[PDB]
Each structure stands twice: as structure tokens, then as C-alpha cells.
Design a protein around this ligand. Structure first.
Ligand SMILES: *[C@@H]1O[C@H](CO)[C@@H](O)[C@H](O)[C@H]1NC(C)=O
Ligand SMILES: *[C@@H]1O[C@H](CO)[C@@H](O)[C@H](O)[C@H]1NC(C)=O
Ligand SMILES: *[C@@H]1O[C@H](CO)[C@@H](O)[C@H](O)[C@H]1NC(C)=O
Ligand SMILES: *[C@@H]1O[C@H](CO)[C@@H](O)[C@H](O)[C@H]1NC(C)=O
Length: 376
């Protein structure tokens, strides 16, 4: 059975930090730590008041001159567990029941005879950034794939979830065809937002605390805006018509042709600069050039557009379309367009009723993967 590399989505792996800050936003925030500590996912950092300290440390700072992000003064961030799986199996190291992400799938793989850290490895990354600021990650990923090929005697299967699919596509678009034919067996795509997702507009405008309901939407909005990856996943014109209204208010409509105005009007001009930096990174029309298995959820109400009575600081009414709860059906179907640009097969698998995160622990998903890995 072939070696496997797992690529997570947004919020999809642990992050660690170390501090030596010149100033803090409250006296109760720690200025200095002697070693690295878990900054994601650690529930104690997310309580009211203390959450201000967390935001101050986990935010990225956007530099308009360099068109690049930096960490706050005296803050360093590390991605643990590269080449292992622990940091994407469980988001909170203190805690099994909360943060369980790739754990169920890795348990299945291990039951099928895989060994963590050897023929199954994780490729976690700083998911706050888009691929243009994760160069070193892609070098490490290339090297790890080559090593696994040599050690385990064949090409690797890449298995990616959500935004991890866009990271993986970026990587594959930049490797020569001869390299991919030698080293990549297949690419299994789970819940890929190839065209962006509509709910990114609500996230940027008013915040989204649906995961983290103990925290205020206006507080978490600060983190979500600071992450380049958020603006990278705004809807794209290769999926959506420029005349589709994503956000309606009493006096103005916003389509994907109105992003500059949108960012002005929500008070977040840096987001527009981030979108310009990132909108071209994955070419809409360049196929991956490998056997692709595109798995997407349907039949789950998925935010499609938003009506604001008062914009942007009051919660909107939501209009729902088809998809997996997060990824709109239209964005997930992008993979089929690549079939006419590449010779390798593109296989579609609809997963009716399968929710965005739950698809990773779903029996039908795992049965499909088993067939890909272990054969008939
Ligand atoms: C922002 O970028 C410019 C050019 O790279 C530089 O002059 C300035 O110091 C940067 N800000 C920092 C390092 O805080
Ligand atoms: C916004 O668009 C909808 C239909 O897409 C329309 O009913 C509404 O009148 C428009 N509002 C404005 C201010 O253009
Ligand atoms: C599609 O959107 C891109 C930005 O992603 C923009 O460059 C382009 O003008 C749009 N139109 C066409 C025909 O691609
Ligand atoms: C698992 O996915 C299947 C088929 O794609 C779906 O019918 C089922 O509802 C999912 N499991 C759960 C708990 O939703």
C-alpha cells in the first residue's frame, strides 16, 4: 500500500508561540515566556478579557510597503509535528473530545497497516498565511515526498482537506510533469473550496464565532481579518458570475466585482491588498496533472448570500444553497473543468448529506479512501 501525506485545512493544525514582547494590551497579558506554548488550540486562552491577549499574539501584521505579513514585535510562531500526525489528529493537545480532526481517519489508516511518522505523515503549515508566504513549507513537502518514495518503494498519495487542497494544488502546479509522474500516485481531495466560499464575506464583515460561541463575533473578527488565508478564499469569478449578489443591504449590493468598495466600507482596506496579493496564486485553468479524486458534500444547507438590515456590525439574515455546510456546490465542482486540460483521470464522488468537517470521520469517506489505497 502506498505512502500517504495528509494536508489539513484552515485552523487544521496546532500552532505554538514564544513571547518576548516590548508592550502588552493589558497588564494581565504575559510579556515573556521561557519556552513555546500551544496557541492553537488552547481553550484557556479564549476566555473573555484574556482573549485580547490571544488576539494580540496570534494576529498577523500587514505591511503595506512590503505587501507582506509579519508577526507582532517579540512574538514567534512555530508549526509543530511536521512529518508526524499528532498535530492534525487533535487540535488541542490537552484534550481528546474537543479538536478531533484527522484522528478518526488516521486510526483507520493505522488499522489498515500504516505507521505514523513513517509511511503516513502529516504536512501541517501556518494556515494564517497563503502559499506565497509559505515557501519553506513547499520545499520541505517536496523533500518529504521524495524521501517517502525512496523509503517505501513507490509514489505517494496526497490526501487534503478543505483549504489544504488549494495549498496542494499550488504545490502541484509548480512541479514539473516528469516529477509528478514519478513521485505522485494520486491526489485525494476532500471538501475543496476551489472557487472560494460565500461565507468569507460574512466572516470579514461581521465575524463568525459559530465554532467558538463563547467568544464574541466582533472579537474573533480581528483574528479572521488578520489571516491572509481568509481574503484568499473570497469567491472567484471562474465559479461565480460577477452579477451574483453575495451581500445585500438596504442601499447597496456587493458582487465579486465590488471587493474594493466592500473592504473600504467594512473598514478593512488591508484586506483588499491581501486579495490582490493572493487572487492569482492558483491558476484557475492549470490542472494538477495527476490522478485526482474529488470528494464533495451535498445536501447540506450552505450559506450562499447575506442580507444585512444594518451593515456590517449586526448579524445578517442568511440565504442557503447546496454544498457541505461551508463549501458551496459550485466551488467544489471546479475539478471537473480540469478534465479537458489533463490526461490523467479526474474522478468525482458526491457525498450526499456529508458535512464539511464530519466528512473526515465518515464511514463512506473512509471506505472510499480504503479502496484508493489498498485496491480491490
Ligand atoms: C515595512 O516594509 C518596509 C519595506 O520592507 C520597511 O521599510 C519597514 O521597516 C517595514 N516595517 C517593519 C519591519 O515593521
Ligand atoms: C440588489 O439586488 C437585488 C436583486 O439581486 C434587488 O432586488 C435589489 O433591488 C438590489 N438593490 C440595490 C440597492 O441595487
Ligand atoms: C476574473 O477575475 C480576475 C481576478 O481573480 C481578474 O483578473 C479578471 O479581470 C476577471 N476576468 C476574467 C475574464 O478573467
Ligand atoms: C456520511 O456521509 C454519508 C454519505 O455521503 C451521509 O449519508 C451521512 O449522513 C454522513 N454521516 C453523517 C453522520 O452525517
Amino acid at each position: 500500500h502506498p505512502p500517504v501525506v495528509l494536508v489539513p485545512g484552515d485552523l487544521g493544525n496546532q500552532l505554538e508561540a514564544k513571547l518576548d514582547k516590548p508592550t502588552v494590551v493589558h497588564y494581565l497579558c504575559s510579556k515573556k515566556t521561557e519556552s513555546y506554548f500551544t496557541i492553537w488550540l488552547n481553550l484557556e486562552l479564549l476566555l473573555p478579557v484574556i482573549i485580547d491577549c490571544w488576539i494580540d499574539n496570534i494576529r498577523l501584521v500587514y505591511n503595506k510597503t512590503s505587501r507582506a505579513t509579519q508577526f507582532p514585535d517579540g512574538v514567534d510562531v512555530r508549526v509543530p509535528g511536521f512529518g508526524k500526525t499528532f498535530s492534525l489528529e487533535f487540535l488541542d493537545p490537552s484534550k481528546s473530545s474537543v479538536g478531533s480532526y484527522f484522528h478518526t481517519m488516521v486510526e483507520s489508516l493505522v488499522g489498515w497497516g500504516y505507521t505514523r511518522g513513517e509511511d503516513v505523515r502529516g504536512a501541517p503549515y501556518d494556515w494564517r498565511r497563503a502559499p506565497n508566504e509559505n515557501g519553506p513549507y513547499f520545499l520541505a513537502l517536496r523533500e518529504m515526498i521524495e524521501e517517502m518514495y525512496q523509503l517505501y518503494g513507490g509514489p505517494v498519495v496526497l490526501v487534503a482537506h478543505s483549504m489544504g487542497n488549494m495549498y496542494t494544488l499550488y504545490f502541484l502546479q509548480r512541479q514539473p510533469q516528469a516529477w509528478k509522474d514519478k513521485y505522485i500516485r494520486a491526489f485525494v481531495s476532500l471538501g475543496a473550496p476551489w472557487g472560494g466560499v460565500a461565507k468569507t464575506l460574512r466572516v470579514l464583515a461581521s465575524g463568525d464565532n459559530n465554532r467558538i460561541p463563547v467568544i464574541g463575533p466582533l472579537k474573533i473578527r480581528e483574528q479572521q481579518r488578520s489571516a491572509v488565508s481568509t481574503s484568499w478564499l473570497l469567491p472567484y469569478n471562474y465559479t461565480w458570475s460577477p452579477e451574483k449578489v453575495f451581500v445585500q443591504t438596504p442601499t447597496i449590493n456587493y458582487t465579486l466585482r465590488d471587493y474594493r468598495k466592500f473592504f473600504q466600507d467594512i473598514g478593512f482596506e488591508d484586506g483588499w491588498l491581501m486579495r490582490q496579493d493572493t487572487e492569482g496564486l492558483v491558476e484557475a485553468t492549470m490542472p494538477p496533472g495527476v490522478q485526482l479524486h474529488c470528494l464533495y458534500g451535498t445536501g447540506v444547507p450552505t450559506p450562499d448570500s447575506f442580507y444585512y438590515e444594518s451593515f456590517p456590525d449586526r448579524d445578517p439574515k442568511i440565504c442557503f444553497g447546496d454544498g457541505d455546510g461551508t463549501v458551496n456546490l459550485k466551488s467544489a465542482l471546479q475539478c471537473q473543468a480540469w478534465q479537458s486540460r489533463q490526461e490523467h483521470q479526474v474522478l468525482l464522488q458526491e457525498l450526499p448529506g456529508s458535512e464539511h468537517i464530519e466528512m473526515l470521520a465518515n464511514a463512506t469517506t473512509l471506505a472510499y479512501l480504503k479502496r484508493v489505497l489498498l485496491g480491490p
